[PDB]
Design a binder for this molecule. Structure first.
Ligand SMILES: CCNc1cc(C(=O)N[C@@H](Cc2ccccc2)[C@H](O)CNCc2cccc(C(F)(F)F)c2)cc(N2CCCCS2(=O)=O)c1
Ligand SMILES: CCNc1cc(C(=O)N[C@@H](Cc2ccccc2)[C@H](O)CNCc2cccc(C(F)(F)F)c2)cc(N2CCCCS2(=O)=O)c1
Length: 374
């Protein structure tokens, strides 16, 4: 019943159907492993087709406290309250949860996205205004018998996939699940120990990859990399693809790259391997990313004699973000109960006739260095 319960549009997040209030008001809610506030449009906005109407809910309780959340992209402010929340195509559970009723926003809501709010699935430590505001998943686990785990299978304008709450769906992946420790419970923080491009080690001190943290973030589109890592990665991708030359603006995400329909030269773009810390000392596994992931298609009927793409790798000053383009085609298990994140090749994994996304291990290094930045 939970399979294929996610929809989206490319670059605009994946959402699940939810209800808030009693009687239930149906809203589409963006699934975000990169924050911890459950928030819903609660006043008219140019890009909202619908919004939460507190006055129509018998079960609403105002908490008499405002809240402000600035993301990497977008920001909102609203009023805290609590109400009943359900997931019609999730576990047949309903919980009373904290809800931020958004009454003002700036570059948050997206024209044509089909979602009206956001479900922050990370830990209390990064909830606003502070960690006493219990996140939704914590409320769900406490109030129901749901096991303390969820999994996301994001598939690659319309996109889809599945969120499985309280379990692992074996029909959604092949091969082995490989686990990386959640380093600290705030974001879903993990450790990258090695990066390869086109099979060639980037050859940096591994702490650089995690300056100042690395996170798994379904709510962010791109692979985001620390400046020094971004610059080295762009250099390596440019070199591997040097049979064709693209404008500087493409590499900065300012510009599209386009080819005649059906002729995208995938083979000239390299594979990227991120090695994630294993559960055992100096052991790791790698997830391999194809250009079908990091060249994000941009749908536009005006450009449709062509296939056009945005470079979905960008610079960060706040550490690494493994966003949606990285997660797509993997089955990603957020095993909160065992403080670990599992990766496997998903049922909707990306591949062509030459190459495929992969999750492979184990790998061993003799280097005794801790790759964590702090
Ligand atoms: C899905 C919408 N496209 C993008 C969304 C976000 C982003 O900030 N996502 C946050 C949720 C969100 C979803 C939809 C619209 C707007 C925001 C996600 O929560 C960020 N997670 C890290 C974070 C950063 C700062 C504060 C917090 C806090 F914890 F919530 F406070 C979390 C970033 C982003 N990037 C920056 C542009 C250039 C492209 S990008 O991918 O590099 C593209
Ligand atoms: C904090 C829980 N609010 C509420 C919980 C339930 C309830 O009975 N939940 C059961 C599932 C359900 C889903 C949708 C409609 C009706 C029922 C659930 O199976 C009960 N689980 C045991 C339980 C009961 C009470 C408290 C708790 C708790 F875990 F301690 F919180 C658990 C109903 C409810 N209301 C529905 C609108 C109209 C009035 S209401 O108060 O009855 C508020």
């Amino acid at each position: 019943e939970m399979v294929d319960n996610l929809r989206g549009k490319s670059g605009q997040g994946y959402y699940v159907e939810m209800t808030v209030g009693s009687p239930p008001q149906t809203l589409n809610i963006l699934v975000d492993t990169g924050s911890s506030n459950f928030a819903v449009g609660a006043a008219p906005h140019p890009f909202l087709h619908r919004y939460y109407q507190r006055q129509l809910s018998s079960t609403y309780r105002d908490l008499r406290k405002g809240v402000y959340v600035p993301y990497t992209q977008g920001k909102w402010e609203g009023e805290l309250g609590t109400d009943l929340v359900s997931i019609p195509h999730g576990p047949q559970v309903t919980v009373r949860a904290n809800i931020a009723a958004i009454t003002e926003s700036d570059k948050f809501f997206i024209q044509g996205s089909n979602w009206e709010g956001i479900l922050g699935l990370a830990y209390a430590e990064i909830a606003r205004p502070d960690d006493s505001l219990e996140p939704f998943f914590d409320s769900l686990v406490k109030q129901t018998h749901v096991p303390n785990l969820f999994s996301l299978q994001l598939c690659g304008a319309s996109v889809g996939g599945s969120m499985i709450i309280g379990g692992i769906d074996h029909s959604l992946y092949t091969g082995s699940l490989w686990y990386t420790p959640i380093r600290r419970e705030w974001y879903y923080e993990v450790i990258i120990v090695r990066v390869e491009i086109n099979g060639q080690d980037l050859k940096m001190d591994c702490k650089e990859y995690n300056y100042d943290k690395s996170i798994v973030d379904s709510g962010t589109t791109n692979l985001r990399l620390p400046k020094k890592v971004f610059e080295a990665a762009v250099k390596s991708i440019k070199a591997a693809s040097s049979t064709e030359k693209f404008p500087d603006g493409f590499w900065l995400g300012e510009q599209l790259v386009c080819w005649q329909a059906g002729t995208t030269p995938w083979n000239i773009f390299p594979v990227i391997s991120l090695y994630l810390m294993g559960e055992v000392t100096q052991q790791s596994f790698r997830i391999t990313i194809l250009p079908q992931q990091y060249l994000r298609p941009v749908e536009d009927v005006a450009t449709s004699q062509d296939d056009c793409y945005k470079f979905a790798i960008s610079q960060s000053s706040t550490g690494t973000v493994m966003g949606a383009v990285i997660m797509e085609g993997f089955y990603v298990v957020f095993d909160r109960a065992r403080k670990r994140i599992g990766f496997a090749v998903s049922a909707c994994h990306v591949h062509d006739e030459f190459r495929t996304a992969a999750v492979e291990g184990p790998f061993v290094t003799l280097d005794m260095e801790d790759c964590g930045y702090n």
